[PDB]
Design an enzyme around this catalytic site. Structure first.
Site, PDB file in Angstrom:
ATOM      1  N   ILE A 113      -9.360 -18.809  -2.694  1.00 38.04           N
ATOM      2  CA  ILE A 113      -8.996 -19.177  -4.056  1.00 38.04           C
ATOM      3  C   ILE A 113      -9.092 -20.690  -4.185  1.00 38.04           C
ATOM      4  O   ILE A 113      -8.563 -21.431  -3.346  1.00 38.04           O
ATOM      5  CB  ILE A 113      -7.586 -18.666  -4.399  1.00 38.04           C
ATOM      6  CG1 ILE A 113      -7.559 -17.134  -4.309  1.00 38.04           C
ATOM      7  CG2 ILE A 113      -7.166 -19.127  -5.792  1.00 38.04           C
ATOM      8  CD1 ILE A 113      -6.181 -16.523  -4.397  1.00 38.04           C
ATOM      9  N   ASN A 148       0.305 -13.886  -1.745  1.00 35.59           N
ATOM     10  CA  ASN A 148      -0.671 -13.114  -0.994  1.00 35.59           C
ATOM     11  C   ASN A 148       0.068 -12.190  -0.040  1.00 35.59           C
ATOM     12  O   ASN A 148       1.026 -12.610   0.620  1.00 35.59           O
ATOM     13  CB  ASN A 148      -1.627 -14.026  -0.220  1.00 35.59           C
ATOM     14  CG  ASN A 148      -2.632 -13.248   0.605  1.00 35.59           C
ATOM     15  OD1 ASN A 148      -3.484 -12.543   0.064  1.00 35.59           O
ATOM     16  ND2 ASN A 148      -2.544 -13.381   1.923  1.00 35.59           N
ATOM     17  N   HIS A 208      -0.189 -10.535   3.287  1.00 35.66           N
ATOM     18  CA  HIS A 208      -0.950 -10.749   4.511  1.00 35.66           C
ATOM     19  C   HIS A 208      -0.332  -9.909   5.616  1.00 35.66           C
ATOM     20  O   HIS A 208       0.861 -10.045   5.909  1.00 35.66           O
ATOM     21  CB  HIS A 208      -0.958 -12.231   4.893  1.00 35.66           C
ATOM     22  CG  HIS A 208      -1.889 -12.561   6.017  1.00 35.66           C
ATOM     23  ND1 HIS A 208      -3.256 -12.406   5.924  1.00 35.66           N
ATOM     24  CD2 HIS A 208      -1.649 -13.042   7.259  1.00 35.66           C
ATOM     25  CE1 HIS A 208      -3.817 -12.776   7.062  1.00 35.66           C
ATOM     26  NE2 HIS A 208      -2.863 -13.166   7.889  1.00 35.66           N
TER      27      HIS A 208
HETATM   28  C1  LIG Z   1     -11.664 -11.207   3.834  1.00 34.86           C
HETATM   29  C2  LIG Z   1     -11.186 -10.641   5.168  1.00 34.86           C
HETATM   30  O1  LIG Z   1     -11.811 -10.853   6.151  1.00 34.86           O
HETATM   31  N1  LIG Z   1      -9.975  -9.844   5.244  1.00 34.86           N
HETATM   32  C3  LIG Z   1      -9.163  -9.557   4.030  1.00 34.86           C
HETATM   33  C4  LIG Z   1      -8.343  -8.285   4.285  1.00 34.86           C
HETATM   34  O2  LIG Z   1      -9.169  -7.259   4.651  1.00 34.86           O
HETATM   35  P1  LIG Z   1      -8.583  -5.728   4.479  1.00 34.86           P
HETATM   36  O3  LIG Z   1      -8.229  -5.484   3.032  1.00 34.86           O
HETATM   37  O4  LIG Z   1      -7.336  -5.582   5.320  1.00 34.86           O
HETATM   38  O5  LIG Z   1      -9.704  -4.630   4.974  1.00 34.86           O
HETATM   39  P2  LIG Z   1     -10.326  -4.574   6.499  1.00 34.86           P
HETATM   40  O6  LIG Z   1     -11.653  -5.294   6.531  1.00 34.86           O
HETATM   41  O7  LIG Z   1      -9.374  -5.239   7.465  1.00 34.86           O
HETATM   42  O8  LIG Z   1     -10.552  -2.999   6.930  1.00 34.86           O
HETATM   43  C5  LIG Z   1     -10.796  -2.049   5.931  1.00 34.86           C
HETATM   44  C6  LIG Z   1     -10.386  -0.691   6.462  1.00 34.86           C
HETATM   45  O9  LIG Z   1     -10.711  -0.599   8.050  1.00 34.86           O
HETATM   46  C7  LIG Z   1      -9.751   0.027   8.616  1.00 34.86           C
HETATM   47  N2  LIG Z   1      -9.099  -0.844   9.634  1.00 34.86           N
HETATM   48  C8  LIG Z   1      -9.362  -2.273   9.627  1.00 34.86           C
HETATM   49  C9  LIG Z   1      -8.745  -3.151  10.607  1.00 34.86           C
HETATM   50  C10 LIG Z   1      -7.850  -2.604  11.611  1.00 34.86           C
HETATM   51  O10 LIG Z   1      -7.351  -3.327  12.409  1.00 34.86           O
HETATM   52  N3  LIG Z   1      -7.563  -1.182  11.652  1.00 34.86           N
HETATM   53  C11 LIG Z   1      -8.173  -0.205  10.657  1.00 34.86           C
HETATM   54  O11 LIG Z   1      -7.948   0.956  10.675  1.00 34.86           O
HETATM   55  C12 LIG Z   1      -8.735   0.387   7.490  1.00 34.86           C
HETATM   56  O12 LIG Z   1      -8.883   1.687   7.117  1.00 34.86           O
HETATM   57  C13 LIG Z   1      -9.101  -0.532   6.345  1.00 34.86           C
HETATM   58  O13 LIG Z   1      -8.763   0.121   5.027  1.00 34.86           O
HETATM   59  O14 LIG Z   1      -7.351  -8.484   5.354  1.00 34.86           O
HETATM   60  C14 LIG Z   1      -6.462  -9.640   5.050  1.00 34.86           C
HETATM   61  C15 LIG Z   1      -5.504  -9.838   6.172  1.00 34.86           C
HETATM   62  C16 LIG Z   1      -7.279 -10.914   4.830  1.00 34.86           C
HETATM   63  N4  LIG Z   1      -6.381 -12.063   4.503  1.00 34.86           N
HETATM   64  C17 LIG Z   1      -5.234 -11.909   3.623  1.00 34.86           C
HETATM   65  O15 LIG Z   1      -4.545 -12.842   3.386  1.00 34.86           O
HETATM   66  C18 LIG Z   1      -8.282 -10.721   3.746  1.00 34.86           C
HETATM   67  O16 LIG Z   1      -7.579 -10.483   2.489  1.00 34.86           O
END
Ligand SMILES: CC(=O)N[C@H]1[C@@H](OP(=O)(O)OP(=O)(O)OC[C@H]2O[C@@H](n3ccc(=O)[nH]c3=O)[C@H](O)[C@@H]2O)O[C@@H](C)[C@H](NC=O)[C@@H]1O
Length: 189
Positions: free
Chosen positions: A53, A67, A69
């Site tokens: 952002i 956010n 996190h």
């Molecule tokens: C831009 C970026 O890099 N990250 C985003 C965001 O990504 P996120 O929405 O969490 O989606 P993700 O890519 O992690 O995975 C998608 C699907 O995979 C499966 N999965 C994944 C990882 C795991 O360990 N175990 C699982 O099972 C699960 O089903 C999931 O729905 O995470 C935040 C922390 C970041 N920061 C925020 O402040 C960013 O906002």
């Protein structure tokens, strides 16, 4: 009020926010400084948003942009926090923090430690983090929505990771997200 949800669409979160008779708009793409998506936006909620952002937006919505996190800040700022919390054997949990310039460095509103179990996978731990932060958000949103809380400064230290940082460890994820976490503890130390 008008709430801008940055990240993928979530009916439950829309319905929940709309439960308080607030207006909800959703957006998951790159957001320019002058975008009309921001006009008349009282509060920004970032959850799964995959873009930084702009500092101008940050300062505009300072104290009005949070956010969600899925890490225990200051540890595991940035990308793939769940994975890194095991690779580097760091505290595990979820944090709601005000958004500031820089990735996941703003004031901490509330945190919650999330434990794991012997037979946990990255999937089951991620799902537990998701349920916890979503539960945690609904617990404190009634208080946050009324500006009833102030955050404390995020302690320097902790850790930070970029998306590419995990490339050297993907070979450990034999079963993808179904990989047991035990095989990953401290593998990055
Ligand atoms: C831009 C970026 O890099 N990250 C985003 C965001 O990504 P996120 O929405 O969490 O989606 P993700 O890519 O992690 O995975 C998608 C699907 O995979 C499966 N999965 C994944 C990882 C795991 O360990 N175990 C699982 O099972 C699960 O089903 C999931 O729905 O995470 C935040 C922390 C970041 N920061 C925020 O402040 C960013 O906002």
């Amino acid at each position: 009020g008008k709430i801008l949800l940055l990240g993928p669409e979530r009916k439950w979160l829309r319905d929940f926010l709309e439960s308080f008779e607030d207006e909800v708009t959703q957006y998951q793409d790159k957001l320019d400084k002058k975008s009309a998506i921001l006009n008349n936006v009282d509060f920004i909620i970032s959850y799964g948003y995959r873009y930084i952002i702009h500092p101008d937006i940050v300062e505009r919505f300072k104290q009005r942009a949070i956010n969600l996190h899925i890490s225990y800040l200051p540890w595991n700022k940035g990308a793939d926090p769940n994975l890194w919390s095991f690779l580097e054997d760091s505290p595990k949990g979820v944090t709601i923090h005000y958004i500031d310039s820089g990735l996941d460095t703003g004031e901490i509103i509330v945190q919650r430690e999330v434990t794991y179990y012997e037979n946990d996978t990255l999937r089951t731990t991620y799902e537990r983090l998701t349920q916890t932060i979503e539960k945690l958000f609904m617990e404190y949103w009634p208080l946050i929505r009324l500006g009833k809380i102030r955050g404390i400064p995020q302690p320097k230290g902790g850790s930070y990771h970029k998306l590419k940082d995990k490339e050297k460890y993907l070979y450990l994820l034999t079963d993808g997200w179904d990989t047991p976490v035990q095989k990953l503890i401290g593998k990055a130390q």
